[PDB]
Design a protein around this ligand. Structure first.
Ligand code: FAD
Ligand code: NAP
Ligand code: A1D7R
Length: 426
């Protein structure tokens, strides 16, 4: 009655925990058959951003809910199945499933002239129902629409094999004894390459720009555990930038020595894929570096340096787009399309709406959504207030004009945050 929470991933869950602790009535509508978000999908063969080999890249203690520790036998990087089974164990403990409508997908959301909102949801019977609520929190994710390159390289329609996106990938056992291209240097790209490097007769990583490849451990310490140590927070922003450069060199060496393009920017300048595996697959011959796909010649793939190779599939690890279709009116958007959310959560012109988890931090997202949830729980029953709308559009203007001095102009920088100072204001 009081709050519709869209989505039962890691964030929607932290939301209900906040509202329930406080006394607010709410429901959680999710389209999937259970709770968990993306972490439910590969353990169930469902089409999604993940794959049957995915693990956490962040330390378990820094990633679990601070009131519900993970099972002590979990390793530092649990498998996607361990994670999903843990997220349902919180919903059971914290007391929330009676509020959760599974297999119920939200289709429409519109603000009514008098203040409440009208949510239309389609369920399992493929049918429809309209409802009214006081407030609404969006917790749907930002990895839902895949971003293919525009355009495809010439001749893609006369290709012998299949062309697919990382969202369609599950296991390489489906590419056993075939020959595959992987497009991208992202988090999914190196993971799927390394998986295909043990099933396909031959795997190739096509790359157009260089990113800094970093292992998930320096001095036995996870990269995000290093982040919290005080001697790291003791160093300056140029001291630690080099501390890292020196260490990387000792651990892996230089990237052009593996056949890979040098990034055109120092560390922290928008580039870090984490992987314990990808370089060693290259030094073992299991994956071969290529330079950008230029045309589809029949059953072969022509690249930009003139080389060519027989291939039966191309898996595109090119990322995702941020879309909210149940919001007829466009979601937090500006002119150039930068996100405009006061403190990365609240719209300025739409009382009663909130977005949780639309933030990209360095490391675990959890303590960030926890603060977002706890604050929003006090803005719903009045224990918390907001600035006037003008004064709110100024904080946003300050956040944006200042993030161009760090990543310059691009597309997904508008939700980039520093875990340290962000959580200090909650
Ligand atoms: C490949 C990948 C690897 C990651 N690795 C890490 C990592 O190692 N460490 C880390 O800390 N973070 C990691 N993250 C980030 C973070 O853990 C995830 O974004 C996390 O799942 C956040 O969950 P969420 O609730 O924000 O969103 P989601 O997981 O997307 O959950 C949102 C839910 O909304 C539901 N939904 C969507 N639309 C509707 C609708 N219209 N009606 C009803 N329900 C709807 C979906 O079914 C989904 O369950 C990773 C992200 C990705 C994509
Ligand atoms: N858990 C983690 O470790 C982690 C880390 C960072 C982000 N994430 C989140 O999780 C998501 C999963 O990462 P991801 O690997 O799927 O996405 P990603 O990090 O955005 O990877 C995209 C890759 O595709 C390339 N690419 C994009 N458009 C291209 C084009 N038109 N032609 C050629 N190459 C192109 C990019 O190189 P270019 O630079 O040339 O575009 C880049 O190498 C990310 O989108 C992000 O939201 C997770
Ligand atoms: C050593 C140093 C350069 C590490 C830099 C770094 C490490 C991890 C991430 C992530 C992953 C996180 N799991 C998420 O996307 O939610 C996003 N950006 C990152 C930057």
């Amino acid at each position: 009655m009081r709050v519709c929470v869209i989505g039962a991933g890691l964030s929607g869950l932290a939301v209900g925990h906040a509202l329930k602790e406080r006394g607010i009535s709410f429901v959680c509508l999710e389209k999937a058959p259970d709770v968990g978000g993306i972490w439910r999908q590969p353990g169930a063969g469902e089409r999604g951003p993940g794959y049957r080999t995915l693990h956490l890249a962040t330390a378990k203690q820094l990633t679990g809910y601070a009131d519900f520790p993970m099972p002590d036998a979990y390793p530092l990087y649990p498998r996607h199945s361990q994670v999903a089974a843990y997220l349902r164990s919180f919903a059971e403990w914290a007391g929330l499933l009676d509020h959760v409508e599974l297999r119920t997908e939200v289709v429409s959301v519109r603000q009514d002239a008098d203040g409440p909102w009208t949510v239309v949801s389609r369920g399992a019977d493929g049918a429809q129902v309209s409802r009214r609520f006081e407030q609404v929190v969006v917790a749907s994710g930002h990895h839902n629409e895949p971003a293919l390159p525009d355009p495809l390289p010439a001749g893609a329609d006369s290709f012998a094999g299949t062309i697919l996106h990382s969202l369609d990938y599950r296991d390489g056992g489906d590419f056993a004894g075939r020959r595959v291209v992987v497009v991208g240097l992202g988090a999914s790209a190196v993971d799927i390459a390394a998986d295909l490097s043990r099933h396909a007769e031959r795997t190739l990583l096509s790359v157009r720009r260089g990113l800094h490849i970093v292992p998930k451990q320096l001095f036995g310490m996870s990269v995000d555990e290093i982040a919290e140590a005080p001697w790291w927070n003791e160093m300056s922003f140029d001291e630690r930038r080099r501390w890292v450069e020196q260490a990387l060199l000792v651990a892996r060496g230089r990237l052009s020595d593996y056949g890979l393009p040098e990034p055109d920017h120092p560390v922290f300048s928008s580039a870090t894929t984490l992987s314990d595996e990808i370089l060693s697959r290259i030094r073992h011959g299991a994956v071969t570096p290529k330079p950008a796909i230029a045309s589809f010649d029949g059953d072969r793939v022509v690249f930009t340096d003139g080389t060519s190779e027989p291939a039966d599939a191309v898996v595109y690890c090119t990322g995702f787009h941020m879309t909210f279709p149940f919001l007829p009116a466009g979601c937090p958007m500006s002119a150039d399309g930068s996100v405009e959310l006061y403190r990365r959560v609240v719209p300025a012109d739409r009382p009663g709406l909130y977005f949780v988890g639309l933030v990209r931090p360095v490391g675990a997202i959890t303590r960030l959504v926890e603060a977002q949830a706890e604050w929003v729980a006090r803005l719903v029953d009045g224990a918390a207030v907001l600035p006037a709308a003008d004064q709110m559009r100024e904080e946003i203007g300050t956040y944006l004009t200042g993030i161009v001095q760090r990543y310059g102009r691009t597309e997904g920088a508008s939700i980039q945050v520093d875990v340290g100072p962000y959580l200090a204001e909650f």
